[PDB]
Design a protein around this ligand. Structure first.
Ligand SMILES: *[C@@H]1O[C@H](CO)[C@@H](O[C@@H]2O[C@H](CO)[C@@H](O[C@@H]3O[C@H](CO[C@H]4O[C@H](CO)[C@@H](O)[C@H](O[C@H]5O[C@H](CO)[C@@H](O)[C@H](O)[C@@H]5O)[C@@H]4O)[C@@H](O)[C@H](O[C@H]4O[C@H](CO)[C@@H](O)[C@H](O)[C@@H]4O)[C@@H]3O)[C@H](O)[C@H]2NC(C)=O)[C@H](O)[C@H]1NC(C)=O
Ligand SMILES: *[C@@H]1O[C@H](CO)[C@@H](O[C@@H]2O[C@H](CO)[C@@H](O[C@@H]3O[C@H](CO[C@H]4O[C@H](CO)[C@@H](O)[C@H](O)[C@@H]4O)[C@@H](O)[C@H](O[C@H]4O[C@H](CO)[C@@H](O)[C@H](O)[C@@H]4O)[C@@H]3O)[C@H](O)[C@H]2NC(C)=O)[C@H](O)[C@H]1NC(C)=O
Ligand SMILES: *[C@@H]1O[C@H](CO)[C@@H](O[C@@H]2O[C@H](CO)[C@@H](O[C@@H]3O[C@H](CO[C@H]4O[C@H](CO)[C@@H](O)[C@H](O)[C@@H]4O)[C@@H](O)[C@H](O)[C@@H]3O)[C@H](O)[C@H]2NC(C)=O)[C@H](O)[C@H]1NC(C)=O
Ligand SMILES: *[C@@H]1O[C@H](CO)[C@@H](O[C@@H]2O[C@H](CO)[C@@H](O)[C@H](O)[C@H]2NC(C)=O)[C@H](O)[C@H]1NC(C)=O
Ligand SMILES: *[C@@H]1O[C@H](CO)[C@@H](O[C@@H]2O[C@H](CO)[C@@H](O)[C@H](O)[C@H]2NC(C)=O)[C@H](O)[C@H]1NC(C)=O
Ligand SMILES: *[C@@H]1O[C@H](CO)[C@@H](O[C@@H]2O[C@H](CO)[C@@H](O)[C@H](O)[C@H]2NC(C)=O)[C@H](O)[C@H]1NC(C)=O
Ligand SMILES: *[C@@H]1O[C@H](CO)[C@@H](O[C@@H]2O[C@H](CO)[C@@H](O)[C@H](O)[C@H]2NC(C)=O)[C@H](O)[C@H]1NC(C)=O
Ligand SMILES: *[C@@H]1O[C@H](CO)[C@@H](O[C@@H]2O[C@H](CO)[C@@H](O)[C@H](O)[C@H]2NC(C)=O)[C@H](O)[C@H]1NC(C)=O
Ligand SMILES: *[C@@H]1O[C@H](CO)[C@@H](O[C@@H]2O[C@H](CO)[C@@H](O)[C@H](O)[C@H]2NC(C)=O)[C@H](O)[C@H]1NC(C)=O
Ligand SMILES: *[C@@H]1O[C@H](CO)[C@@H](O[C@@H]2O[C@H](CO)[C@@H](O)[C@H](O)[C@H]2NC(C)=O)[C@H](O)[C@H]1NC(C)=O
Ligand SMILES: *[C@@H]1O[C@H](CO)[C@@H](O)[C@H](O)[C@H]1NC(C)=O
Ligand SMILES: *[C@@H]1O[C@H](CO)[C@@H](O)[C@H](O)[C@H]1NC(C)=O
Ligand SMILES: *[C@@H]1O[C@H](CO)[C@@H](O)[C@H](O)[C@H]1NC(C)=O
Ligand SMILES: *[C@@H]1O[C@H](CO)[C@@H](O)[C@H](O)[C@H]1NC(C)=O
Ligand SMILES: *[C@@H]1O[C@H](CO)[C@@H](O)[C@H](O)[C@H]1NC(C)=O
Ligand SMILES: *[C@@H]1O[C@H](CO)[C@@H](O)[C@H](O)[C@H]1NC(C)=O
Ligand SMILES: *[C@@H]1O[C@H](CO)[C@@H](O)[C@H](O)[C@H]1NC(C)=O
Lengths: 431, 126, 128, 130, 97, 130
């Protein structure tokens, strides 16, 4: 009939988009520089709304994974470069009886450019390689090395991702929501929750649990080359420690250049390891094999094994504990074939010369942590990898790092608001 | 310009082992997954396993577990930094392992099983 | 703009109860009422009652309040505006007078003065 | 009324969502509360906020709708855009469903609103020339 | 889980070679051509999408668990062994000659 | 009409160029589509775009012309500004020729338009005080 167009401004309509999200806080991650998080976190429920999500096409995980890499390189700029340490090392074994951590001495530069000094230090064997006894730092024939500033914090801080004005973040309050599909119960938030950027491997640490039951993800579970993300609903307690009482020695290697070395080990020499409750891990491995039958069959066998090969950062549980990077042999956790007081101890190693991420260009020297190291964490997730009939084996994997933040950013999605709507109604303007 | 270059053929005996290479060039090595396919006359093309250069994460096929091993060795010199070398090792060789071994890569790094690029082949006679 | 397929033509005898289904598609099942209408051999058409898949609210005629068992599930959402729901139908004191063809019906609008009016009909189910 | 909040009626009818416009009119620009990572990235987001906002105010200005939340115009509703009834729109489909059906013709309508305004102040220019 | 038939196809340059391949699971099946001595060549992927440099004579169709590959006009170079592929599994081959 | 385009009537009469204002009203702000050379230089240009635009909207707002493309006011045309006839302007010289002749008095006119608006809403303030 007499229908003319009428412009509406401020209508609830959005589109899929990817913008530059900013961080909010309440260390390396420079969380002091983010906007102070609002004490009132407004969450508005979008009743009658269904939205299509996909944690694998999600861009917040691609942006954050670069926002952590760009945070790592940003924090090591003013820190001391350990380039003169790439010198011929004279190493022995530290007195004991396995000869792991070495005792190396070397002619080192001083504050005066014409004076040398014969100083010594301890290096784990993972940081050195022989020549033909003579050694050298592992990174010398590859890249330069920057020592981490001993005043920045390696501690994961709850980081909040927020969308700019005119954009919005879409939550998903579905408590059985697998990664993809349409979330039936959707709400909107100005900022995400407290994301702890815990760099982990194989076993996701300190993550957010799942309500109701434990779900597993993976974009296509039948594609064996897709990392399966399992998310526990109850937390399995894991305790880790480096029992050796270490010492840190400051070595002046120039005008203001002070390399911090491992002096000696006070007291006993022991072995760094981790503990989990075998009962809690047995029931949790039961919870994972429960949901695994809904995708593979109620009669097929499910086998667990350790890694099949690759780098050190993937074949072992690698993480941070008090400020030092463990590499925990997880073969004692994945050794159970399922069909139908306790304490499991993992032998962990320690590295100081790491590259992190997987970039070829720069390695970081972590100065040794003084005192005895022990940290208590929860493992909340798991990154598995299946291997030709009706019996599926599963092994841990940790190829890509951005699968970590993806296990926390699956509940979110960025959309842009376009508040311009044109719709007809029997309305016209005068003359 | 994706191009995969392998090593020469080898004649082995039962009980020994093999080591073949696969130097790729023309694409980011750590972004795309590589595979190993053997082709014996009168048999099905057998998939040995894939390897992701990002950390070296590998997945072996069941009939080869314990005998197959795949590694990598990407160069660390930023001038020609777009190349890696996927190595394949098969121990305790039998006469059934006589075939031509290929290394393959998907048409794109999103889907791995669309082998558009193939190596020239490394024939092995046990 | 979607289908509302029902069950078959199950014929029983008086005194018993009969279950009738109504599987929806092509539309948001929780956005529109589900009416139930029948045309028996003895009268014309008679409005039985509707139910809200969103509010879970019922309103049925006094001639069928003490006989009709009417329930709905919860939709399995396919897309943002598509879903797949189900509406169930059962009677109590059955006679040969209730012999007729039964169908479900999706509501007309989502608001206004004709929110529940039976717009999109099913296919029909022959009773006893 | 019920304070549903920001985008509270995204799944509701276009007639119910049209009565709560000043809710999404506030939070489209939010507000107020130097070289690092988020520092440069925050300023890049603060500029983009006012650009997308001024585009919607510039478009509203050249249509004669500057200051309106609901604005009536002269362009008649072409049946080729959407040959749907008035009751099957405002009391049925949502604003999200509406934008998908009009996504094609939405550029033609934006041009019809511009000249409909220029050929209105030009007519009023002659209306006050005496 | 892949059953490829036939095993051999005797044809002349000018006919049409149609080779099927039944699969138990559903996925992105593909096809390969291996001329004598040379390496296999990707022909069709994801069911019906044609590869690069492949003539339009090659075409693939799908109906349920059955995937078919047909060559509209055989030449002296199209004679070889063809394989179907889903995930990591392959067919036994079909040598056309 | 003929879609001459952006600044298509820069050499045409002021009467012909005055009927195509929404063409240069759109591209004055364009739109939407991080540390390098052009990166910092692009953001510096994106900020300057909205500043010069808001100045022309702020000036239009304090004149009572907010939302107008052609705006009539109260300030009478002083013969000292341009003692030219109405026909020798709108059907002769172009908008470029016009700005050179008014470049002097253009600042006095901008002040006369401001108080002519404040002494209009103040009069209307008393007009609605009863
Ligand atoms: C999400 O989406 C759903 C589905 O679209 C929306 O639910 C629908 O909302 C519309 C409008 O809000 C409803 O239309 C109205 O229907 C009522 C009929 O209800 C009356 O009778 C009921 C049965 O007898 C009775 O339950 C009601 O009593 C109250 O108690 C129930 C308890 O469950 C409570 O839940 C109810 O909300 C009631 O408050 C009630 O007495 C009808 O009366 C309405 O007509 C009036 O209003 C219209 C204008 O809206 C006016 O034009 C009329 O003249 C009259 O004044 C109106 O038709 C519809 O029934 C709902 N259900 C559907 C479509 O299945 C929901 O609102 C959406 N929510 C959000 C947040 O987006
Ligand atoms: C890694 O390797 C470094 C070597 O590069 C070790 O450092 C050396 O450790 C040894 C002990 O293991 C140190 O030797 C001790 O030195 C003491 C200092 O005395 C010196 O100075 C006085 C002058 O005041 C001289 O008179 C004296 O002769 C020394 O030259 C000595 O007091 C110690 O004597 C002990 O041994 C003798 C002989 O067995 C006994 O009779 C004594 O009673 C006494 O018990 C001893 O000689 C050496 O100085 C260290 N070198 C440096 C440069 O510090 C690290 O310990 C090693 N770290 C690890 C973890 O293995
Ligand atoms: C997973 O989360 C855990 C808790 O959120 C992490 O545990 C934290 O680990 C850090 C470092 O490993 C600890 O910081 C240490 O603090 C102690 C001193 O703390 C004690 O004294 C203070 C008083 O000031 C008291 O408040 C504390 O409760 C302690 O009694 C020192 O030894 C060091 O300075 C060191 O920085 C945290 O204390 C610890 N938190 C808890 C609750 O235990 C764990 O590291 C996380 N895992 C990973 C992999 O990130
Ligand atoms: C530290 O101790 C280990 C273990 O005893 C030594 O390893 C030996 O190295 C020699 C090389 O000369 C080999 O011939 C032996 O077979 C190794 N032993 C074992 C058990 O593996 C290592 O050489 C010691 N390092 C130093 C610097 O003394
Ligand atoms: C830098 O030197 C190290 C020495 O350990 C090289 O790494 C070894 O290389 C040999 C053969 O080149 C391999 O057999 C070993 O498995 C390698 N070990 C490790 C831990 O990688 C490394 O290749 C050298 N890098 C460059 C760029 O020359
Ligand atoms: C590890 O274990 C649990 C995970 O649920 C956490 O302890 C509980 O945390 C919740 C949430 O703050 C509290 O409501 C409970 O009272 C806590 N339980 C106890 C016994 O204190 C704990 O914070 C987790 N640690 C992490 C995630 O770092
Ligand atoms: C680890 O070793 C350090 C020293 O190497 C110990 O620190 C000493 O602590 C006592 C307090 O009981 C102080 O009186 C000493 O002065 C400290 N020594 C130094 C050099 O600072 C520390 O107690 C040891 N801790 C453990 C768990 O073995
Ligand atoms: C990991 O360490 C924590 C802390 O030492 C252990 O929690 C203690 O458990 C004992 C035995 O039940 C209690 O008596 C203590 O009160 C607990 N400590 C605290 C602070 O609550 C935990 O049992 C350890 N778990 C494993 C697997 O080693
Ligand atoms: C992780 O621990 C397992 C055992 O818990 C180690 O397995 C050993 O593997 C070697 C061959 O690689 C065998 O000869 C040993 O007999 C195995 N030991 C046991 C106890 O079974 C494994 O080597 C460890 N990982 C690393 C990197 O050392
Ligand atoms: C793995 O990916 C394939 C391809 O996307 C999925 O196959 C589709 O599955 C849906 C759901 O049954 C069907 O409607 C499509 O017809 C299938 N397409 C193809 C090409 O097979 C498969 O579902 C995925 N794996 C799982 C476990 O969902
Ligand atoms: C330091 O240099 C001197 C030069 O004579 C050499 O004898 C000595 O071995 C060097 N020190 C080390 C630890 O190599
Ligand atoms: C998630 O659920 C949807 C429908 O509920 C299903 O289509 C999809 O395959 C599921 N995701 C996975 C990884 O199976
Ligand atoms: C995995 O377990 C096997 C068998 O115990 C062992 O030979 C191998 O060394 C283990 N690998 C790792 C990385 O733990
Ligand atoms: C409707 O739009 C078409 C172009 O899409 C145009 O040709 C036609 O004249 C228009 N009709 C009305 C009544 O606006
Ligand atoms: C908009 O154009 C596309 C062109 O591919 C067409 O498919 C679609 O149907 C059009 N929209 C409507 C509402 O017809
Ligand atoms: C014209 O402007 C002059 C100042 O340039 C002023 O003195 C005079 O009063 C003005 N006359 C009129 C009629 O506006
Ligand atoms: C504006 O002022 C300058 C002052 O040098 C003068 O030369 C010029 O003639 C003036 N403009 C007009 C239109 O008179």
């Amino acid at each position: 009939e007499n229908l003319w167009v009428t412009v509406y401004y401020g209508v609830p309509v959005w589109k899929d988009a990817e913008t530059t999200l900013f961080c909010a806080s309440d260390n390396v991650w420079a969380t002091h520089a983010c906007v102070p998080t609002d004490p009132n976190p407004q969450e508005i429920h979008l009743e009658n709304v269904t939205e299509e999500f996909n944690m694998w096409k999600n861009n917040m995980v691609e942006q954050m994974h670069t926002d952590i890499i760009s945070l790592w390189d940003q924090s090591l700029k003013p820190c001391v470069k350990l380039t003169p340490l790439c010198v011929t090392l004279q190493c022995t074994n530290v007195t004991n009886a396995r000869g792991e951590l070495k005792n190396c001495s070397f002619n080192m530069t001083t504050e005066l450019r014409d004076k040398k000094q014969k100083v010594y230090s301890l290096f784990y064997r993972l940081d050195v390689v022989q020549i033909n006894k003579e050694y050298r730092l592992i990174n010398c024939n590859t890249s330069a090395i920057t020592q981490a500033c001993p005043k920045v914090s390696f501690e994961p801080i709850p980081i909040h991702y927020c969308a700019p004005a005119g954009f919005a973040i879409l939550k998903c309050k579905d408590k059985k929501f697998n990664g993809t599909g349409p979330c039936p119960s959707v709400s909107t938030v100005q900022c995400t929750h407290g994301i702890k950027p815990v760099v982990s491997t194989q076993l996701l640490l300190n993550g957010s649990l799942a309500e109701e039951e434990v779900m597993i993800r993976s974009e296509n579970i039948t594609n064996n080359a897709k990392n399966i993300l399992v998310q526990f609903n109850t937390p399995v307690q894991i305790n880790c420690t480096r029992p050796n009482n270490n010492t840190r020695k400051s070595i002046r290697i120039g005008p203001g250049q002070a390399f911090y070395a491992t002096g000696d080990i006070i007291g006993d020499i022991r072995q760094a390891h981790c503990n989990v409750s075998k009962a809690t891990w047995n029931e949790t491995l039961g919870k994972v094999v429960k949901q695994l039958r809904k995708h593979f069959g109620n009669n097929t066998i499910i086998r667990f094994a350790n890694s099949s090969g690759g780098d050190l950062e993937v074949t072992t549980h690698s993480f941070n504990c008090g400020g030092e990077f463990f590499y925990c042999n997880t073969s004692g956790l994945f050794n159970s074939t399922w069909i139908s007081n306790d304490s499991i101890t993992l032998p962990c190693r320690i590295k100081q010369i790491i590259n992190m991420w997987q970039r070829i260009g720069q390695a970081m020297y972590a100065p040794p942590i003084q005192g005895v190291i022990r940290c208590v964490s929860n493992i909340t997730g798991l990154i598995l990898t299946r291997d030709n009939s009706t019996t599926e084996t599963f092994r841990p994997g940790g190829g890509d790092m951005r699968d970590n933040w993806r296990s926390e950013l699956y509940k979110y999605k960025v959309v842009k608001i376009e508040p311009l709507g044109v719709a007809p109604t029997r309305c016209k303007r005068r003359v | 310009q994706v191009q995969l270059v392998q090593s020469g053929g080898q004649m082995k005996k039962p009980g020994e082992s093999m080591r073949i290479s696969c130097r790729a060039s023309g694409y980011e090595f750590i972004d795309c997954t590589l595979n190993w396919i053997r082709l014996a006359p009168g048999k099905r093309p057998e998939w040995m396993g894939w390897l992701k250069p990002r950390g070296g994460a590998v997945n072996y096929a069941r009939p080869l577990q314990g005998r197959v091993t795949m590694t990598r060795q990407l160069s660390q010199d930023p001038d020609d930094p777009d190349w890696g070398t996927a190595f394949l090792e098969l121990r305790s060789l039998t006469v059934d392992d006589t075939a031509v071994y290929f290394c393959t890569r998907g048409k794109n790094c999103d889907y791995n099983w669309d082998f558009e690029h193939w190596g020239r082949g490394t024939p092995v006679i046990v | 703009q979607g289908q509302l397929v029902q069950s078959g033509a199950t014929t029983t005898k008086p005194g018993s109860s009969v279950k009738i289904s109504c599987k929806t598609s092509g539309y948001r099942f929780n956005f529109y009422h589900i009416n139930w209408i029948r045309q028996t051999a003895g009268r014309g058409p008679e409005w039985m009652g509707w139910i809200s898949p969103y509010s879970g609210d019922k309103n049925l005629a006094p001639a069928f309040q003490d006989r009709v068992n009417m329930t709905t599930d919860t939709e399995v959402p396919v897309t943002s505006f598509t879903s797949t729901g189900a509406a169930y139908m059962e009677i109590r004191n059955l006679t040969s007078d209730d012999t007729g063809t039964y169908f479900c019906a999706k509501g007309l609008l989502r608001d206004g003065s004709s929110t529940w009016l039976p717009y999109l009909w099913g296919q029909g189910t022959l009773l006893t | 009324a019920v304070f549903l909040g920001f985008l509270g009626a995204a799944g509701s009818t276009m007639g119910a969502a049209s009565m709560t416009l000043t809710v999404q009119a506030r939070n489209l620009l939010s507000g107020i509360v130097k070289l690092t990572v988020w520092g440069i990235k925050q300023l890049q987001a603060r500029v983009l906020a006012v650009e997308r906002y001024l585009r919607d105010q510039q478009l509203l200005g050249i249509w004669g709708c500057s200051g309106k939340l609901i604005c009536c115009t002269n362009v008649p509703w072409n049946s080729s855009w959407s040959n749907r009834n008035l009751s099957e729109i405002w009391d049925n489909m949502t604003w999200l469903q509406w934008d998908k059906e009009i996504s094609n013709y939405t550029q033609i309508i934006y041009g019809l609103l511009e000249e409909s305004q220029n050929q209105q102040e030009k007519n009023e220019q002659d209306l006050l020339a005496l | 889980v892949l059953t490829q038939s036939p095993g051999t196809l005797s044809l002349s340059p000018g006919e049409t070679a149609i080779i099927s391949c039944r699969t138990s699971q559903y996925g992105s099946l593909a096809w390969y051509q291996q001329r004598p001595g040379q390496a296999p060549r990707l022909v069709i992927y994801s069911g019906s999408t044609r590869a690069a440099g492949i003539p339009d004579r090659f075409s693939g169709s799908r109906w349920g668990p059955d995937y078919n590959l047909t060559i509209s006009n055989l030449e002296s170079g199209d004679f070889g062994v063809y394989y179907c592929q889903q995930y990591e599994f392959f067919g036994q081959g079909t040598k056309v000659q």
